[PDB]
């Protein structure tokens, strides 16, 4: 199957099951990564290099005023990727326990987190003309094909001039695969690009994550606006 439509047979339960799952996950980095905390630094290093291209090299360079971290969890990415590069950061996540723990986890630099939005991305509207970078990592699998497209379109309206959206997530080898543990889907490259491009966003960059463990799904980063 090549669409959520076919592999997701109950959309209501697709969302409620995932909400239930994350509600009882420990608010820790090992929880944010399903036992793969040992690749967090490898992940962040590649994300930093991927993003520095847009922040440094002009002439339409991306600003450093504010970033949005979507599906931020306890702030693993906000802490080590976004806060060092952006003056202020907003976080949005559906799990209250993760936003509460993020206050402690982020430490003193967490004071530059402006808003802790508690909302599913399918119901969330980022404020217009607010963000230089919108970072969406390991959460697009929790949205249906349609909701993802519509969320990306709402993100487009919240970008400042020269801003970009970044998606970083697992890719399936073929088709759309449902994970019955956490109630998420994994889509192949063709499906993701189609959802992006057919939603009215331009693909600016695309990069496969190297040096990952052999046993895990491939991971891709996309830059779009």
């Amino acid at each position: 199957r090549g669409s959520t439509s076919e592999v997701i047979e109950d959309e209501k339960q697709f969302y409620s099951k995932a909400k239930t799952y994350w509600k009882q996950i420990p608010p820790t980095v090992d929880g944010m990564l399903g036992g793969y905390g040992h690749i967090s630094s490898i992940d962040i290093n590649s994300s930093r290099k991927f993003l520095q291209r847009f922040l440094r090299e002009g002439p339409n360079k991306t600003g450093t005023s504010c970033a949005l971290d979507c599906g931020a969890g306890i702030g693993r990415i906000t802490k080590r990727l976004l806060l060092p590069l952006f003056r202020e950061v907003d976080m949005v996540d559906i799990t209250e326990d993760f936003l509460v723990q993020a206050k402690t986890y982020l430490g003193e630099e967490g004071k530059r987190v402006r808003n802790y939005f508690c909302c599913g991305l399918q119901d969330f509207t980022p404020e217009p003309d607010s963000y230089d970078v919108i970072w969406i990592q390991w959460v697009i699998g929790h949205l249906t094909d349609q909701h993802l497209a519509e969320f990306l379109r709402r993100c487009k309206g919240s970008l400042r001039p020269n801003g970009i959206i970044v998606i970083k997530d697992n890719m399936a080898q073929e088709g759309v695969i449902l994970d019955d543990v956490d109630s998420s889907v994994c889509r192949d490259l063709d499906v993701v690009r189609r959802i992006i491009c057919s939603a009215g966003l331009s693909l600016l960059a695309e990069e496969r994550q190297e040096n990952l463990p052999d046993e895990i799904y491939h991971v891709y980063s996309f830059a779009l606006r």
């Binding site: 944010m32 990564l33 399903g34 793969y36 690749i39 390991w138 697992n170 994970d179 994994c186 990952l212 463990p213 046993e215 895990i216 799904y217 991971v219």
Partner: peptide, 4 residues
């Protein structure tokens, strides 16, 4: 996050 990452999956097998």
């Amino acid at each position: 996050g990452p999956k097998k």
